[PDB]
Structure 1
């Protein structure tokens, strides 16, 4: 809890809690001076000078570098007070893709093919930017993709944004902190980091597979290995042959054969979503 003269309490009116972690939570808040809603994550402050601090500050640094892109979550501010570290990001009104999937699942639905191409194109724009900046996300998965649904009053919209930049690292990085095992490419687990950007492409394909209604992905075991041999998880729908082949080459066992994020966004299959 924060003090009543904290920056957090004075400058923001806290609304709804919107997420929870081990040592923190996320609130939907209004900033009093501008009237706009933000997501503010407040976590226990990492020990100053520690490796945990290093990892926390890397996230903020990634945000500061990447957050200008239209398909990466905007960052506004970060600070520390009351033994908490705070990050104020844009609030995304549709929650994460994991939340949108779970809502879909509850009503016996899924993203249909046109929605999946839209997802894939938009997050791939996101990755193209990240990779152009010599960075890799390393943790692409539905819970780290955020959704904003907007209405434009005076046109003469659903946006997917990459968030949770806590695993972002540079392309040539010799150590890599692995992301979610359900989405982790085999080469990264083996500690081959020659083609890091293609680990994000792999994770994105599996993320679109989850959007498309696949069952829970394995964290380990024979099914996990089967996926890493290049076999797509089963989905409860029949997608076009061309779109299925895009997804499948995105999980190719050789990273070099997976599309770049650039090739991805230029792909003829996704021209229908442009």
Structure 2
């Protein structure tokens, strides 16, 4: 196999199939390589599997999207940029336990970086559809969007919904008029997680209350300007939320730019 002869496996970094940290023998370099069961040819699962690859391959010029090098094929493999700093989810678990979270200046920088990623994705007429901390990777720290498995075209009539902790009500209601603002809503909840919040609910009354536009408790004092920008980003009306372009140019974020 090309995987075996081309790469030396260093360590398993993800299970689900598996992602390994590998050194390509020819270029000396470390890559994250994801191995999955190859779906039946011409199936709906294969189409979903191939969109991730097509997405990766138009989304390779961006500072805040994980770079793609190659993909090939009873397994499919994708070889991406290895991010040395881990996921934002793991940074956020380490913080949780030590009672020291991202401070406001770092929450702004996270928000702005990912927001530039989404601006790039959105201007490609694409949407990500699973923005959450386990799909933001760290490598000045850099934040990069990864895991392009739910990526779709912006006017798509059918959608695979992302994680329910981070899901906009209108997407759940099957309303895809404003898909870009689903990414916006998930970015805000991602930032709240990073600020120190309790694990987000997956359903039930607390789930609904957030979808009414109310921020979860944040165990630290943020400026009103900043808090207000997070709240508008979870507004029940997707049209009231900022576009990624509006986000990155927002005055609240100027001091991060």
- What is the root-mean-square deviation in Å for CA atoms of aligned residues? 0.9
CA distance in 1, matches of 2:18, 2:98: 28
CA distance in 2, matches of 1:47, 1:128: 34
SS of 1:273 mapped into structure 2: coil
CA distance in 1, matches of 2:106, 2:132: 17
Cα deviation, 1:3-52, whole Å, max 9, x if unaligned, reads xxx1111110110111111xx11110000111110000111111222111
Residue 57 of structure 1: CA displacement?
Answer: 0.6
CA distance in 2, matches of 1:78, 1:123: 25
Residue 105 of structure 1: CA displacement?
Answer: 1.5
CA distance in 2, matches of 1:225, 1:116: 25
Cα deviation, 1:209-254, whole Å, max 9, x if unaligned, reads 0011110111111111100000001111011111100001000111
Please say if 1:234 is aligned against 2:217: yes
Cα deviation, 1:180-224, whole Å, max 9, x if unaligned, reads 111000111101111110011000000000011110111111111
Cα deviation, 1:106-162, whole Å, max 9, x if unaligned, reads 22221111110000000000000111111111110001111117xxxxxxxx11001
Q: What are structure 2's unaligned runs of at least 5 residues? A: none
Structure 2 residue aligned with 1:249, among 212, 216, 232?
232
CA distance in 1, matches of 2:60, 2:210: 32
Structure 2 residue aligned with 1:187, among 155, 166, 170?
170
CA distance in 1, matches of 2:68, 2:154: 22
Structure 2 residue aligned with 1:269, among 248, 252, 255?
252
Alignment map for 1:56-205 (pairs within 5 Å): 56-80=49-73, 83-148=74-139, 158-205=141-188
Please say if 1:225 is aligned against 2:216: no
Q: TM-score, normalised by structure 2?
A: 0.98
Q: TM-score, normalised by structure 1?
A: 0.92
SS of 1:89 mapped into structure 2: strand
CA distance in 2, matches of 1:58, 1:48: 14
Q: Which residue of 2 aligns with 1:25?
A: 18
User: Could you tell which deviates more after superposition, 140-149 or 199-208?
Assistant: 140-149
SS of 1:173 mapped into structure 2: coil
Cα deviation, 1:53-95, whole Å, max 9, x if unaligned, reads 1111110110001122111110000011xx2111000001111
CA distance in 2, matches of 1:89, 1:218: 31
SS of 1:28 mapped into structure 2: strand
